[PDB]
Design a protein around this ligand. Structure first.
Ligand SMILES: CC(=O)N[C@@H]1[C@@H](O)[C@H](O)[C@@H](CO)O[C@H]1O
Ligand SMILES: CC(=O)N[C@@H]1[C@@H](O)[C@H](O)[C@@H](CO)O[C@H]1O
Ligand SMILES: *[C@@H]1O[C@H](CO)[C@@H](O)[C@H](O)[C@H]1NC(C)=O
Ligand SMILES: *[C@@H]1O[C@H](CO)[C@@H](O)[C@H](O)[C@H]1NC(C)=O
Ligand SMILES: *[C@@H]1O[C@H](CO)[C@@H](O)[C@H](O)[C@H]1NC(C)=O
Ligand SMILES: *[C@@H]1O[C@H](CO)[C@@H](O)[C@H](O)[C@H]1NC(C)=O
Lengths: 224, 116, 101, 224, 111, 106, 103
């Protein structure tokens, strides 16, 4: 019997560029009068759910608890109380969220693994991998880019984080972007940009080229 | 190399450094003919980090990538009191850096009759 | 610089080696050179890597005021005094700062 | 009191080669001889209990039982009906489950990507990644076979299959194996073994070592 | 080459293929003197894959790479009716293939 | 590592060679390094192979609890005994783990 | 390739002073330090305001135009395995070295 909250993720924070304080309750009742008060921990109820959805208890809140707070310490900093009175609740169900603070902040380590030689030999396609290992609080946001142009999210899909075996706390993730072999054999930057809280200035990208392993000082060729 | 790959333009930079009096004057000449002052933009003298009493100032000449390919000269002439003749000239063209590439081949059991 | 500070020796003794700590928060490590490969191999690092032979027997300590990275080998199973290397950065091989046989 | 049906997974029927239907009861405390009744569609599969525990931390432990049938029976697609009879539950009943049929089969394509040069430069550890693409009974069992036989399951981590970007039906997974740099540097083969339905004879093996990338014909070494 | 990465035993095979009426007598010699029969084992004739009227057979010799590395001759002699002399021989050495090893080494930066 | 152990030489003396047992269960062998050729030569391995002139005199024992693999030459013919190598892995040359330099003259 | 070896053995308490020849053609000077198997002597001090990190604070330079000498003094002189401490003039450093100096 508590008001579920969906705290914004650093992926959501970075992509949206703003925080969306949300207490849409997964698994509650929405008969009627289900006021979300997006209160701050100081009791100042700022903007609450504006643009809230419909009254439908589909074993959850259809009506939203989402708002639009301000990030800086308005996501971090303190905590945000959501006090929900129902049409059947004398004591309003309340809950504050400090964006689970207290975790250990590690910088991700990013490696771009080029497509395997067999995949290029098949010539059907190619899959570049962006291995992200070693992070502290597990919530990275990986995107791909090409010559500074952010590629569409359709052609790259990135796995969710998952407990690194050797290091208990640290996590790893994979973002594989799948090209065209005729795109790979010609020079293309294909940068990987990782946005994480613990990185220097929260972002760091590393690119890979078809010519990224080749030794530079000598262009060996075989003429047959 | 990135600007040359883009092929739209190129920016040659004359970096004057270590001159103690603040005032300096940089001008860029081509084929002995001074270029129009619009093309080159020179920075105001700014104190150098590791040199307390010595300053530095860049100067950037923007030229088309084709002009850089047609191996040109672009000298950058600098005028200061401390200089011997009150001016020194430095020139760099497209072939300034290249260091002779040996294109070593290795014909082995191959034919074509081709005479050697 | 090759100030091999400790060739100390005991079957159960503990050797403590002081290591130059640059402080720009870079990864600092204790490394071991292998004759066969010819390349130094990490044994301890700021990133929590503990080498297979030295599981639990080596500890790292930080003093920013003193600028010291101490590496403590608590049980010397008298395995080969190697030419150990302090270094910094993400390149173990070329990032070495000091040697410590 | 609460009826749960855990169907056999391909990983289990591969490891033990005997499919293992599972049924479970929850919300009940463990009186004695904790189990779930067992029948097949014809009721012949009356099997014995296992996993006996005194109580949950809340003293409401879920009773556990197991039943065994032939491995091809689960893939036959016929419904299997296991009964549910326990002393704690008020009224016995029965449930039926089966393998979900009508599901496209696409052969997995397995690639092995060696650790990036930077990871080897750190000289701490190295991740060899087994990437499996284009498989869609949504099931894959990937394990690692080096030097003849099986590495400890803790070493490798296999991500859950995730629906591909271009191909709707076809999925993918990644299995990272983290090993110390010296074995890789030495030379050590590490196989990756993708057990899957859509595979010709269900198992595919791939091999990567330090010398796979290097060309075999020409050997150019630059000396100073 | 995979098993020679192991030092136990090298198995040399004498694939006899495309013959008929299927009965061939295969044996081995080292330096002209017949090897003991427990060293080598020959497979029974089996009908061919592709061609119908022909057959094929095998004969493996288990040596040990000390005799192999160190280059023996290890010849296989096959007797069959259709052969013009009724007998044919083939020979293999540790070096019966080895394409030439081109090893150039230029030092040219002095220019 | 080279815990070399020179052993006594007798006609019936059973010289014993200690080998690490990695528990990995790969082919564990003892290698007579052939210095002139520069390549390994196995005298006995986990497989039932025994070298030709070492036949009927060498035997092997496994002890995982002690991480130990015994190679005992029950009948020593006091022949040219060079450096031996306890090793593991399918590859035999590369595979060596322990180098023991033994002389049966003393 | 003149090779004075000053070899001041004061170690920590020593203050080595070396006088290298000087052209007096107003060209810049430098005191090379042959860097660990590079071959490219790195400059310790020069007419330019550059002083190395390691040799900072303790290395000083004094002029003798009439005597045609330049005196470089490492005051602290705390041990640092001294290799050929060449002193030479010119914009180019490795090529312009004249006198080697061993410490
Ligand atoms: C076969 C080969 O590698 N030689 C190339 C040649 O194709 C090219 O036309 C020319 C300049 O790019 O010289 C070499 O770099
Ligand atoms: C002869 C042989 O097998 N390999 C040679 C090697 O000895 C030699 O060092 C190299 C270039 O010097 O050329 C190759
Ligand atoms: C060598 O350089 C040419 C220059 O056009 C390039 O096309 C070729 O791909 C290079 N060789 C290799 C092996 O990439
Ligand atoms: C070296 O360059 C020439 C000039 O284009 C090229 O045609 C020639 O084929 C190259 N040399 C070889 C054959 O390697
Ligand atoms: C040398 O290069 C020239 C380029 O004009 C070419 O015509 C000539 O054939 C080359 N030499 C040989 C022996 O082929
Ligand atoms: C292949 O090149 C590497 C480069 O260092 C060299 O070490 C190696 O010996 C070469 N392979 C052979 C068979 O010579």
């Amino acid at each position: 019997i508590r008001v579920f909250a969906i705290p914004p993720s650093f992926a959501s924070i970075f992509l949206t560029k703003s925080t969306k304080l949300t207490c849409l309750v997964t698994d509650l009742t929405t008969y009627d009068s289900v006021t979300i008060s997006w209160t701050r921990q100081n009791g100042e109820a700022v903007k609450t759910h504006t643009n809230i959805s419909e009254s439908h208890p589909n074993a959850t809140f259809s009506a939203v608890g989402e708002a639009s707070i301000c990030e800086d310490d308005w996501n971090s900093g303190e905590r945000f109380t959501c006090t929900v009175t129902h049409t059947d609740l004398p004591s309003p169900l309340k809950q504050t969220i400090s964006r689970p603070k207290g975790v250990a902040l590690h910088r991700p380590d990013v490696y771009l693994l080029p497509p395997a030689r067999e995949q290029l030999n098949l010539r059907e396609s190619a899959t570049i991998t962006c291995l992200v290992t070693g992070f502290s609080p597990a919530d990275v946001f990986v995107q791909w880019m090409q010559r500074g142009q952010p590629l569409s999210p359709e052609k790259y899909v990135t796995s969710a984080p998952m407990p690194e075996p050797q290091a208990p706390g640290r996590y790893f993730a994979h973002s594989i972007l799948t090209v065209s072999e005729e795109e790979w054999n010609t020079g293309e930057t294909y940068t990987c940009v990782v946005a994480h809280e613990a990185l220097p200035n929260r972002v760091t990208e590393r690119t890979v080229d078809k010519s990224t392993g080749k030794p530079t000082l000598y262009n060996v060729s075989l003429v047959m | 190399r990135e600007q040359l790959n883009l092929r739209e333009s190129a920016t040659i930079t004359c970096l004057v450094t270590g001159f103690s009096p603040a005032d300096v004057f940089v001008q860029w000449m081509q084929r002995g003919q001074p270029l129009s002052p619009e093309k080159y933009v020179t920075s105001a003298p700014m104190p150098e980090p590791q040199a307390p009493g010595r300053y530095f100032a860049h100067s950037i000449l923007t030229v088309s990538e084709e002009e850089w390919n047609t191996g040109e000269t672009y000298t950058c002439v600098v005028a200061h009191e401390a200089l011997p003749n009150r001016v020194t000239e430095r020139t760099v063209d497209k072939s300034t850096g290249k260091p002779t590439l040996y294109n070593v081949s290795l014909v082995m059991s191959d034919t074509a009759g081709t005479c050697y | 610089i090759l100030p091999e500070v400790k060739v100390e020796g005991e079957l159960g003794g503990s050797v403590t080696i002081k290591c130059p700590l640059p402080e720009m928060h870079v990864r600092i490590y204790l490394c071991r050179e292998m004759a066969g490969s010819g390349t130094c191999g990490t044994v301890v690092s700021t990133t929590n890597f503990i080498k297979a032979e030295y599981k639990g027997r080596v500890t790292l300590k930080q003093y920013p005021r003193k600028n010291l990275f101490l590496v403590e080998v608590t049980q010397l199973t008298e395995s080969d005094s190697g030419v150990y290397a302090c270094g910094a950065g993400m390149n173990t091989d070329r990032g070495k700062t000091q040697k410590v046989t």
